[PDB]
Amino acid sequence: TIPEYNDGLLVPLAPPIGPFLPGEVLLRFRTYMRQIDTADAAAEAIDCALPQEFVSWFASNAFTVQSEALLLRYRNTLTGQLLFECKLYNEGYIALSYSGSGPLTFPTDGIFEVVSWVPRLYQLASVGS
Amino acid sequence: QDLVPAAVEQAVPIQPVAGAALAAPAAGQINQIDPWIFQNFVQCPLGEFSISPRNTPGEILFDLALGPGLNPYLAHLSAMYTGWVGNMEVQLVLAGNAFTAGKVVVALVPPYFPKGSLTTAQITCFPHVMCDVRTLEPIQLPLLDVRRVLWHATQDQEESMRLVCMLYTPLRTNSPGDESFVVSGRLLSKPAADFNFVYLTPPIERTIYRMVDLPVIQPRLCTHARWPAPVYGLLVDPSLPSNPQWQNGRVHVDGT
Amino acid sequence: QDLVPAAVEQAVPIQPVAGAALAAPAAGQINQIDPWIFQNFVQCPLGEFSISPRNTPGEILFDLALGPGLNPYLAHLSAMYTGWVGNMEVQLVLAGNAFTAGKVVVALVPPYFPKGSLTTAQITCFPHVMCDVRTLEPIQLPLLDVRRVLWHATQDQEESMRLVCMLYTPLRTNSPGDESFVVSGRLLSKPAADFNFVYLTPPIERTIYRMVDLPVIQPRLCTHARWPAPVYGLLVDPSLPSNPQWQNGRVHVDGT
Amino acid sequence: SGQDLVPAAVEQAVPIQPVAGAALAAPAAGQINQIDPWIFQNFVQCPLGEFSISPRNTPGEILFDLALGPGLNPYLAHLSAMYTGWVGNMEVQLVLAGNAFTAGKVVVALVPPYFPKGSLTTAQITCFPHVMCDVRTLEPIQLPLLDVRRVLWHATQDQEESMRLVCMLYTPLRTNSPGDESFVVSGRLLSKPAADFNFVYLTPPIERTIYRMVDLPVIQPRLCTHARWPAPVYGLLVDPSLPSNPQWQNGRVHVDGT
Amino acid sequence: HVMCDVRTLEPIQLPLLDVRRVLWHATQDQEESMRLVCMLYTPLRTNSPGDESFVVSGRLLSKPAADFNFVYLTPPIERTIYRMVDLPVIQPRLCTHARWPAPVYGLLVDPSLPSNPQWQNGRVHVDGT
Numbered sequence A: 001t002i003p004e005y006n007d008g009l010l011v012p013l014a015p016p017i018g019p020f021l022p023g024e025v026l027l028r029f030r031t032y033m034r035q036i037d038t039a040d041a042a043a044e045a046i047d048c049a050l051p052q053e054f055v056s057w058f059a060s061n062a063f064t065v066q067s068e069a070l071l072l073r074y075r076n077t078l079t080g081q082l083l084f085e086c087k088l089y090n091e092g093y094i095a096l097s098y099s100g101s102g103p104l105t106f107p108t109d110g111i112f113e114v115v116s117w118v119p120r121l122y123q124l125a126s127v128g129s
Numbered sequence B, C: 001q002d003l004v005p006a007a008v009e010q011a012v013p014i015q016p017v018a019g020a021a022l023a024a025p026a027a028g029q030i031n032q033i034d035p036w037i038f039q040n041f042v043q044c045p046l047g048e049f050s051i052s053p054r055n056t057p058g059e060i061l062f063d064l065a066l067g068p069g070l071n072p073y074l075a076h077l078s079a080m081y082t083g084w085v086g087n088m089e090v091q092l093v094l095a096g097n098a099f100t101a102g103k104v105v106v107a108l109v110p111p112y113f114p115k116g117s118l119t120t121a122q123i124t125c126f127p128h129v130m131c132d133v134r135t136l137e138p139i140q141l142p143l144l145d146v147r148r149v150l151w152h153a154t155q156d157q158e159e160s161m162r163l164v165c166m167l168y169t170p171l172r173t174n175s176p177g178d179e180s181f182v183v184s185g186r187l188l189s190k191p192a193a194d195f196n197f198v199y200l201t202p203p204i205e206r207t208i209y210r211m212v213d214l215p216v217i218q219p220r221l222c223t224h225a226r227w228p229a230p231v232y233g234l235l236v237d238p239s240l241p242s243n244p245q246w247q248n249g250r251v252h253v254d255g256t
Numbered sequence D: 001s002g003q004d005l006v007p008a009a010v011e012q013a014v015p016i017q018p019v020a021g022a023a024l025a026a027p028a029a030g031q032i033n034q035i036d037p038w039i040f041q042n043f044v045q046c047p048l049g050e051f052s053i054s055p056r057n058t059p060g061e062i063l064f065d066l067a068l069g070p071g072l073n074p075y076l077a078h079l080s081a082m083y084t085g086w087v088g089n090m091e092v093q094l095v096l097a098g099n100a101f102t103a104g105k106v107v108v109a110l111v112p113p114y115f116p117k118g119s120l121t122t123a124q125i126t127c128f129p130h131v132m133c134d135v136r137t138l139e140p141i142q143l144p145l146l147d148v149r150r151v152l153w154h155a156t157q158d159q160e161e162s163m164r165l166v167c168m169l170y171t172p173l174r175t176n177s178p179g180d181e182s183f184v185v186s187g188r189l190l191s192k193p194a195a196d197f198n199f200v201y202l203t204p205p206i207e208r209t210i211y212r213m214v215d216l217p218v219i220q221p222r223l224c225t226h227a228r229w230p231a232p233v234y235g236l237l238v239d240p241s242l243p244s245n246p247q248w249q250n251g252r253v254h255v256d257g258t
Numbered sequence E: 001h002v003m004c005d006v007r008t009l010e011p012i013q014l015p016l017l018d019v020r021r022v023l024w025h026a027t028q029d030q031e032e033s034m035r036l037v038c039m040l041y042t043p044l045r046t047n048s049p050g051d052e053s054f055v056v057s058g059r060l061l062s063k064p065a066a067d068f069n070f071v072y073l074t075p076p077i078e079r080t081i082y083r084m085v086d087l088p089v090i091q092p093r094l095c096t097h098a099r100w101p102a103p104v105y106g107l108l109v110d111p112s113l114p115s116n117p118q119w120q121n122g123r124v125h126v127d128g129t
């Protein structure tokens, strides 16, 4: 949550990460940090929208947009299995049409490949928990 | 005495717009393109959309714009040249059953038409082509080059003839069917007889109309953008806060 | 003033490639074939494929190659001759309902195009024909003979014009239907007007392009290949080790 | 302006017949393919079109060595992502116009295909159709580059055997100038397709081709991160009083990726 | 382009054409017109005594072609855009200071003081900001 930027006052800051079409959740990248912990023993997961090498590789080559989202296509580099299909919205975050209840983790040894530009209303194929 | 046949229903009519004939006495060069780029319909970069049964009539399924960013060959060639002028020709394919029952209406909205929001009765007032989602063959349109200036520059902040597509009658299944059956569509484009570029420059820079490319970096070989540690997983979760307000690791796709 | 009809959508265009006109001053002979082999569409040896609902868009359903191993008459006649040169013509038939809703796109990939893996947006950049799985009539293509050399040898380690077919939009049923309903396809081929072989040899040997034939031996009249005893049964079992690592009784189909 | 230089090295009658371009490969491709008639109208500098002759070079050094292709033109190296094939000749200009005090001669040969690559000593670069040009010549030296070939066309992937154009420092570079400096004649290479160059078969334009010269990121070297310790970069510099050939192990990568 | 040797005698003459998208241009609104860009192609190799260091100078001089034209006679305006910056004809001793309300008593250079100050009075842009 937003820390204290002023001492008690309001500041300028980026807008919330939205909005989504009905049925889409936020694809999260997950890393675990170092934590001082008196009682618990689990890992403190922090979540980001895009990792580095994506925030670089942007602002180094400046692309245009031409539409409201990019339809990516995550597939594993071995056997060419298609893991899922996501929408990289033009505001630098990935939406993924998942209608389950709990989490659903994917393997991290595939490569995102841009397929096309898709409008805001495009309807992704559901993923299966 | 005549016969008025009860089935023709199509073929949008045009009046030929001049291409290089207006641009010629004011451009330094008028650069032909390969005579075989006019022969094939190749898929638009934005050639992707879907019509779900939860779309209401009036929704604008796509909204293109006459440019050279409608053809992967002209988006490539348009890095050597500084501006274009000429017509194009689009066709769309729709992949639906004999169960889905809707009609879409692809209209040719001129430039400088006030960009607000068209209704369903105003879309059929343009040169349009009406088509349902059960057609097996792709349907095509001429995207002409109505313009005020003599030629366009391949830096697209200029207005050009749009191609708007609206869901005209709601998509609903002749059968009970499924409520998650989306009708995928695709667009495909090619120059018409009167397209040609203007002024040979070097392949300028990265470009605009350059398609986004992502680094070939598996996410486990990445770095988290809110902590100095490698990426240790991918997930999706509806239970966590839907719209967080992170501040680090945020970036547009245009680099800002 | 013109009319641009809103439905033609097909007919791949060609420029005629020379057949025996290039090969003639360098081949010893130029051998015609029966004038009635050009009249019928007979089924390719590899003329078999299926499109299941578990195929993802991008999958390459088949990938042929212009040769004389695309027609059971030219695969036979090509045992007397030492090399060929000329065009061909393919047609495919697809057996689908009015429930299945996909589109495949049959492309003519040239030779020496880097054999990696085409995406879905790059397949429509070749001379292609787009067709959905609900068509009743078979659709056809000219498989031309783009080549660097003057004629080909019927020992196919030379590159020739391929015919690649990709699943363009995913196969999904307008109805709930079944998830195990496969759309069978078939290929059929015939020479175009400019095919002819080169140099009469004897029917050389067994051959290549010779179709695999299995011995007429009922399995009970066979011998096990890991023990000196007759075969005493056939079965399938998912409970046993799926991928054993046997060492005896293993052999390719090319004899190694 | 002064004409105590060499007027022009006008292309000698190099012993070579005329070679056919797109007239042989036209009835063997299934398309009608033409390239912009304005690309044939000006000489633009090669991608590999920059060399330099210093006086520390010896007779025999190979100054430039560039195979006939579409890699000889920024225009055609860009157009050759859409096609799979090419044929035809090119016309190359060589711009060495060194000072009035320099002296020396380069010899530009026309190496055929299949000739073994490697040494190409100075005793044998003259056995090819060549042009011996002084490094003082004023006006550029147009010299051809023919498509001597065994087949109808070449595929636009560099494994082709195609006619090279080797240049070799024939006599060393010296200067009369009376003061404490030897000039370094720096030549350039300009090129334009001949009258019958042609590409063959339109294919999907892919960026990751054998052409497409290296690009670097537009990021300042003070926002960059270090490749040997987790910190920013606080200044690039050049120091001659250090280990000159170090054996570091991190941040060491070929340009071709590995 | 045109590739000019440094040791040419007579001045290189070349055109500057009016490539445009519109019929004419408006004089009171800087727009996009054709540029001449000059670049150093190969470097300059000469001797140099000890001072000066022999720079090769160059100067561009233009005139209208045979078909230059203006369009529509308006009444002349004084606040145009091709109006060179003129300065007040006032000696500095008669001026007034900008940071302290007093006359100005001496203008001088001084390499000793902070070479890059951050004053906040007497800051202006020559374009009037």
Ligand SMILES: C[C@H](CCC(=O)NCCS(=O)(=O)O)[C@H]1CC[C@H]2[C@@H]3[C@H](O)C[C@@H]4C[C@H](O)CC[C@]4(C)[C@H]3C[C@H](O)[C@]12C
Residues within 6 Å of the ligand: A032, A033, A034, A043, A044, B228, B229, B230, B232
């Ligand atoms: C030590 C890690 C937990 C503590 C932590 O989150 N950070 C400590 C330093 S840092 O901030 O990661 O920089 C644990 C939790 C996540 C673990 C990792 C994860 O379990 C993923 C793989 C799993 C492999 O079996 C072992 C290596 C590994 C890559 C693990 C390495 C390491 O044991 C990790 C990183």
